[PDB]
Amino acid sequence: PIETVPVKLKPGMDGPKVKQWPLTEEKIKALVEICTEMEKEGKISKIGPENPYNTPVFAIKKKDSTKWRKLVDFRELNKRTQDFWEVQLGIPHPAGLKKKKSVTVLDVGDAYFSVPLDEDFRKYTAFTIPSINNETPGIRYQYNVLPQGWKGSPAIFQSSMTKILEPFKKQNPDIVIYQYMDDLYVGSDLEIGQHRTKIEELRQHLLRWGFLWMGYELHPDKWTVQPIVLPEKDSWTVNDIQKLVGKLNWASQIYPGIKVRQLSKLLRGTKALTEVIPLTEEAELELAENREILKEPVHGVYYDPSKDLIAEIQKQGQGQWTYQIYQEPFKNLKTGKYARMRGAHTNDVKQLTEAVQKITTESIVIWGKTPKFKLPIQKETWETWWTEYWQATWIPEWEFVNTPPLVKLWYQ
Amino acid sequence: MVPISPIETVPVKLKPGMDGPKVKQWPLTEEKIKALVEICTEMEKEGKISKIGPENPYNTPVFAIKKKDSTKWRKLVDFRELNKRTQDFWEVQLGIPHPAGLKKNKSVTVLDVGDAYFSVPLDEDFRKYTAFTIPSINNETPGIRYQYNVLPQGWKGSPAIFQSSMTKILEPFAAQNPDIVIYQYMDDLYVGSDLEIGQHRTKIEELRQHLLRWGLTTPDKKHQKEPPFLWMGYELHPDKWTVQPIVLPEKDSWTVNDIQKLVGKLNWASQIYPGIKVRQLSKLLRGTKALTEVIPLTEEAELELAENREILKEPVHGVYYDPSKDLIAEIQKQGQGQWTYQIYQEPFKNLKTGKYARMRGAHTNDVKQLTEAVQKITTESIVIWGKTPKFKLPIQKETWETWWTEYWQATWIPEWEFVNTPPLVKLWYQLEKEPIVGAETFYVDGAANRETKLGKAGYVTNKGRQKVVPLTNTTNQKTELQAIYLALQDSGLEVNIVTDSQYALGIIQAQPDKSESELVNQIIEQLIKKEKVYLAWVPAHKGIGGNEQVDKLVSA
Ligand SMILES: Cc1cc(/C=C/C#N)cc(C)c1Oc1nc(NC2CCN(Cc3ccc(S(N)(=O)=O)cc3)CC2)nc2ccsc12
Ligand SMILES: [Mg+2]
């Protein structure tokens, strides 16, 4: 690949100028070693002071690997980079991916370092290895090849990728293969034995076309909108019925036909919260009629690819996290729950960071893009710590929730 | 002739779509013109500038200035216009090291690199834009026109290009001499090490032999400075550092200007003098742009000042960093949203100190502030030392566990241990998870007329206790909090409270221990006095017993 594909920023926009955040000494040392080798291999070059641009970098460790890895936060550059209609008018996001029994995630970002980047665009990929205590100027580099995590890389490489896969695709017509950024998602409907074989067959096939040896395995079979469930009790207190009417009142914003009049009737008076209230027949029927309403899907829910996806997360305690993905309020496209996050029984922020990555991965499989997160955390706590637990080569956008939502109760 | 390596040229461009400057030269007196001709003749002999023909259309004005007893003329080329039109650069000098991050270097030498500066060539394609004109005597001949071959002092790119050029030249020497440190400040190059004096002088000679590869001669700085280095507002001694003298002025009249400098001195001092406080003195500058408004001091600002003078009476010093020892950060609560901390490796030998002031907000609590202080110190410590310190915090381990397991937000603080230094951070109240058996149930509500601002707040209970209070100059949100306050006031030690106010629930569920609202504050005071409180929410206007009854009582 000697020819470079011309690339430009969007009209009237300069390159990114994002401050490098401070790094620990061990991460700086890891980045110096990594970048020295990338420089020896021609992937990056030192730049001079006439380049004013900057993109943050940091260092991580992928899922159960001990080698440090460089991660560039290209969020700013990606939004300043021209929209890409790469080889065609677009890749129709494969709606069958989310239906496969198993989906394996393969890191193919290594392929990008064999394709040269347009010489006039390289300056915009500038990044800095920072010094400790400002004691030296940072080490300044720019990319000479397609960088991992940049929006342009999958698009500019897509012609090559389709050819690398065609022989495999030819023999395996029933396997769905989808690329998002640095990752390949490989879905099929056969047992892991033949699935892992196919996966290992795919990576060997890739190794002969010019890797990583690692993979992730998903089961999009299960992803849906979880139903609203109501309690089934033989004795209801005043408090129980108040919680029930509150939850139903919330559900009536989502579902038509929900009624609470006969349930509220039971609370006639000014009763102790712990007093047991017998259900009347009218209230039982109304509750049953609400249960029936809640068995059906919500009315008028559809994905619009022109709108952002929004993901909300609630901390439920004891390592459990609930989340909802939507574009308009009360029109959930997907909801779910996470428990016993691995390796962080005593660290809320690690658990939240892992939930964010899992939810982003589900969003990529279902829609081909990442949601904007509403995170139940103070900004300063999140921004001090999330990079410590990040293991993905993409990074979504997020905002912070500072007022506790009442809805946490309803997804409880 | 000993061949010398050229200094690599930095390519430079004007901002997109902008041309070079075209500013008219001012008329000058005959005396100034004579002085400029002699200065520029000498600069031209040294290669700094070259004479140019009349085809170059750019121009920047030149001036001649003097000094009080320094009795010779000075040349000034005003590149403000060219600077507006020149591309942005990587400004590689913005932040400075904090002294507490430096490590001991027994031996330091200061080299003058002011002469090396003029070996940095200006990009040849950019020189045309630096043209200037010495007007002629009596304006009877064409003015003498020059352009720069070197980095003009005052031009936008000179500091970043000079710095980047020296760094690149110095890089192999630093890399192959890991036992020395090199730091450039303007025309000064500071070369330090912890070697014996003889070996140190050898490294210096080796550095000069290195710099000679580019023809750079670097003598020792004029009038070598005895310790301590006066630098960036610090005193750098061989084994200790501190700030330069903190002298608080004595005054009977303080203006907005006086208090600003007082806080600045206090803020600067807080990095080594532990326990400095600036809340009360800062509250006197809330909103005002007139800097001579004499603002009288409150008795609280007077007390704060006096407390700072007691802290400032004697000099204190910080030590330098030892990477072989642990790094420890201790925090104390000072009151009114103020926090102080010390970072050290050995007890009683601070690397540095600092402070943290509560964020602006309507409600807050001490645990959240302590958490914010920890994140701030964490980030500062990564900046200065490249690692997170071990924390010593005035909060019991059990208090922290209760907080983070129950709090609705994710929260984290890194490795820490409790230190029993009052006042301790505590949880002042905790709401019940379930309704309390045997506790009276208060159904509360309030409402207000949006036009008249007239309102009512009240409650009804399962025992038939009731209260409605008429209120003036109020709002719905205010009446809803007032209703909760009345139920707390009028109940026993355990109480169930039912509200339909999502607003009030949102405030209380945030677990504030202090508020900018006196009403919230009074509710907090009541909660602190209870043994058990269960707070339940119901939707308004749904016919829920108890809630419906009080709603009608407070809605007119
Ligand atoms: C080397 C240096 C000098 C200065 C001074 C400017 C002025 N004006 C500033 C910085 C940032 C420097 O840069 C680094 N300084 C250190 N450490 C220091 C070295 C100096 N001492 C003070 C001292 C020692 C000996 C004598 S003495 N006995 O020779 O008179 C006098 C004063 C404290 C520690 N470490 C690094 C690491 C990377 S850069 C850098
Ligand atoms: Mg009401």
Curated annotation (Swiss-Prot), chain A:
Signal peptide: none annotated. Changing residue 164 to V: 70% loss of DNA-directed DNA polymerase activity. 64% loss of RNA-directed DNA polymerase activity. Changing residue 169 to R: In strain: Isolate PV22. Changing residue 49 to G: 74% loss of polymerase activity. 86% loss of RNase H activity. Changing residue 181 to I: 54% loss of polymerase activity according to PubMed:9533880; increases polymerase activity according to PubMed:9657675. No loss of RNase H activity. Changing residue 184 to R: 20% loss of DNA-directed DNA polymerase activity. 21% loss of RNA-directed DNA polymerase activity. Changing residue 182 to A: Strongly decreased RNA-directed and DNA-directed DNA polymerase activities. No effect on RNase H activity. Changing residue 250 to T: Complete loss of polymerase activity. 87% loss of RNase H activity. A motif (Tryptophan repeat motif) lies at residues 382-398. Changing residue 164 to A: 71% loss of DNA-directed DNA polymerase activity. 61% loss of RNA-directed DNA polymerase activity. Changing residue 283 to L: 68% loss of polymerase activity. 10% loss of RNase H activity. This is p51 RT. The gene is gag-pol. The chain holds residues 603 to 1027 of 1447 of the full protein.
